[PDB]
Subunit: 190 residues, 2 copies
């Protein structure tokens, strides 16, 4: 059984447990049971619950990035940002955020993994992509790409995260974020 | 006659905050606030009818002072915009403001009770005020915009503020003014102007 398949089983298991019983349910023993593997195997992928969180968050963003040369850079940008937003504003993503906002101990245990493997990754990836388009004169930027990435992503995603966390809106994809993505691109990175 | 209403209002909001900070929502009772503010029940009830109104007054006190101070015809609209956004950020990213956000994020009952007042009196009001100001600057050609002013206000406050809110909530960053948000404000405005 390939490692990638085992990793997928682990992430699915971790999410199922988080959703059914919160952090308390997402134990190493529980995940192994759910994933169909023994601890000796699980430990190759995760040493503890923080690592499970990192795997889970990574799974949401890893598939986003794998056109470095689109003809319509702005349209490509809209698609990338939309996909990032769908990944980090889903019910599962906002529930995890809410869990950490609500428990200092859980932040203490999981925040480094959560931060390292989430939006920060997407931000770095997007910065690289933006630099390429700027270089090709395809997408000129008035400030460094890393700043554009951060501000753009923040423009689109942050207020919605705030809203969903508070129940002012339901999680994506219940409402259409495409218009917001289009407006941000027009404003921040035309 | 009596001193202006602003005097007692200030006492109420101070009291509400102290109680929130000392004992949570449960400490911020109407009787508690009246006692901490040093006012009669009948006086408090002129200003707030319940805990939700107290939260609304509190949130309003953070944002109310921002716009009276704002020139309609600035010599440098981009510079003025930076100042406005910075001021909104200081008001809504303070330790007290983030604590309140965190409280609501953490308790569904508290959201059910307080969200409407919180929402109506906070960032939503600042967004509306900022949209109005941006529309004025666009109409006057000082700050042209490619999309409607309301959209720019929303996107700009999201970019500059709602993202740090996430960070502070999580403890990734300390509340303002522990770190300097001016560079972020400047970068965001440069993308506009």
């Amino acid at each position: 059984v390939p490692d990638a398949v085992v990793r997928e089983s682990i992430v699915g298991a971790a999410q199922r447990l988080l959703s059914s019983g919160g952090a308390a349910a997402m134990t190493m023993e529980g995940v192994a049971s759910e994933a169909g593997i023994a601890k000796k195997t699980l430990y190759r992928f995760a040493s503890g619950r923080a690592d499970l969180i990192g795997l889970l968050v990574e799974s949401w963003i890893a598939p986003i990035f794998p056109e470095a040369d689109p003809q319509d850079a702005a349209a490509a940008l809209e698609r990338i940002v939309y996909d990032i937003a769908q990944a980090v504003l889903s019910r599962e993503a906002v529930s995890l955020f809410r869990m950490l906002a609500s428990d200092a101990d859980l932040r203490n245990r999981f925040l480094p993994a959560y931060n390292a493997n989430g939006i920060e990754r997407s931000r770095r990836e997007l910065a690289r992509w933006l630099d390429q388009q700027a270089s090709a004169g395809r997408l000129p930027l008035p400030i460094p790409a890393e700043r554009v990435a951060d501000l753009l992503l923040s423009a689109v995603i942050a207020e919605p995260l705030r809203q969903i966390t508070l129940g002012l809106r339901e999680p994506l994809p219940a409402w259409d974020i495409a218009p917001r993505v289009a407006d941000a691109v027009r404003l921040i990175a035309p």
